[PDB]
Amino acid sequence: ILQHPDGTVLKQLQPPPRGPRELEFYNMVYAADCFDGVLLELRKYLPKYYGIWSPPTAPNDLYLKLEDVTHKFNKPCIMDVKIGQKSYDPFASSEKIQQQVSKYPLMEEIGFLVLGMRVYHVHSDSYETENQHYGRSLTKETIKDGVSRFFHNGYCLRKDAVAASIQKIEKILQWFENQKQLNFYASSLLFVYEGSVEVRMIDFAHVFPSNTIDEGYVYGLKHLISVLRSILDN
Ligand SMILES: Cc1cc(C)cc(-c2onc3ccc(C(=O)O)cc23)c1
């Protein structure tokens, strides 16, 4: 992810098949002549899409130009959460499945994994960051405190941002409860709040056509909402 002051990000396509699949996802959802009610509603929850982009002198080098969801914030607090029970897709080999489950074997039980967070601390005027090892170290005993950390600014728990996050996730959940045409593996929610609220879906290299409800995604969203709700009682 490269941030541009124009308020966009350039996301370099991942190696095939992942990068091309992400491109096709955006192209399908944002098809100008698309009138599919499901997909028009989905647009609300994605970064705005500005098309494929490559450097003037390098047509080989493919990027997606996307809305920078963090741009409108002064001190954005950012958390990336992978959603679902499975972070491998329906075409994964035994070996790849094992690779993916190995990365976080609690995915089936918890239904989400914190990929990272960056939290503005008011008292020190500084950011505290967690990397991928943080979320992969969380268990059923520790997930609630693990998520809470995102919303702690050094002096208070930001229950306002927690509640707003629940309200925004609930709309995404409603979208998922009302579509049976796409299943999403290894995709994420990006949470952003002002540390001095956004909740958007990102990372679409493993989105596949389906004829059923995305039950792993729904389980994950519901578990995540339940955790957030519990935090409101702290
Ligand atoms: C600073 C920062 C960190 C992090 C972790 C994410 C983003 C981010 O802001 N707008 C985005 C749109 C799409 C994607 C994406 O990955 O597709 C990422 C975005 C920005």
From Swiss-Prot:
Phenotype upon changing residue 132 to A: Decreased enzyme activity
Textual note on the cofactor: Binds two Mg(2+), but the interaction with the protein is mostly indirect.
Keyword Repressor: no
Cofactor(s), by name: Mg(2+)
Effect on the protein upon substituting residue 100 to A: Strongly decreased enzyme activity
Domain of life: Eukaryota
Single GO term (MF): inositol-1,4,5-trisphosphate 3-kinase activity
Keywords assigned: Acetylation, ATP-binding, Kinase, Lipid metabolism, Magnesium, Metal-binding, Nucleotide-binding, Nucleus, Phospholipid metabolism, Phosphoprotein, Transferase
Effect on the protein of changing residue 103 to A: Decreased enzyme activity
Catalytic activity field: 1D-myo-inositol 1,4,5-trisphosphate + 2 ATP = 1D-myo-inositol 1,3,4,5,6-pentakisphosphate + 2 ADP + 2 H(+); 1D-myo-inositol 1,3,4,6-tetrakisphosphate + ATP = 1D-myo-inositol 1,3,4,5,6-pentakisphosphate + ADP + H(+); 1-octadecanoyl-2-(5Z,8Z,11Z,14Z)-eicosatetraenoyl-sn-glycero-3-phospho-1D-myo-inositol 4,5-bisphosphate + ATP = 1-octadecanoyl-2-(5Z,8Z,11Z,14Z-eicosatetraenoyl)-sn-glycero-3-phospho-(1D-myo-inositol 3,4,5-triphosphate) + ADP + H(+); a 1,2-diacyl-sn-glycero-3-phospho-(1D-myo-inositol-4,5-bisphosphate) + ATP = a 1,2-diacyl-sn-glycero-3-phospho-(1D-myo-inositol-3,4,5-trisphosphate) + ADP + H(+)
Pathway: Phospholipid metabolism; phosphatidylinositol metabolism
Effect of residue 99 to R: Decreased activity with inositol 1,4,5-trisphosphate. No effect on phosphorylation of inositol 1,3,4,5-tetrakisphosphate
Residues binding substrate, per UniProt: 18, 82, 96-103, 132, 206
Enzyme class per UniProt: transferase
Keyword Phosphoprotein annotated: yes
Result when mutating residue 18 to A: Strongly decreased enzyme activity
GO cellular component: ciliary basal body; cytoplasm; nucleoplasm; nucleus
Residues that hold ATP according to the record: 11, 67-69, 80, 203
Cellular compartments annotated: Nucleus
Function statement: Inositol phosphate kinase with a broad substrate specificity. Phosphorylates inositol 1,4,5-trisphosphate (Ins(1,4,5)P3) first to inositol 1,3,4,5-tetrakisphosphate and then to inositol 1,3,4,5,6-pentakisphosphate (Ins(1,3,4,5,6)P5). Phosphorylates inositol 1,3,4,6-tetrakisphosphate (Ins(1,3,4,6)P4). Phosphorylates inositol 1,4,5,6-tetrakisphosphate (Ins(1,4,5,6)P4). Phosphorylates glycero-3-phospho-1D-myo-inositol 4,5-bisphosphate to glycero-3-phospho-1D-myo-inositol 3,4,5-trisphosphate.
Protein name in the entry: Inositol polyphosphate multikinase
Species the sequence originates in: Homo sapiens
Gene encoding the protein: IPMK
Segment of the intact protein contained: 65 to 416 of 416
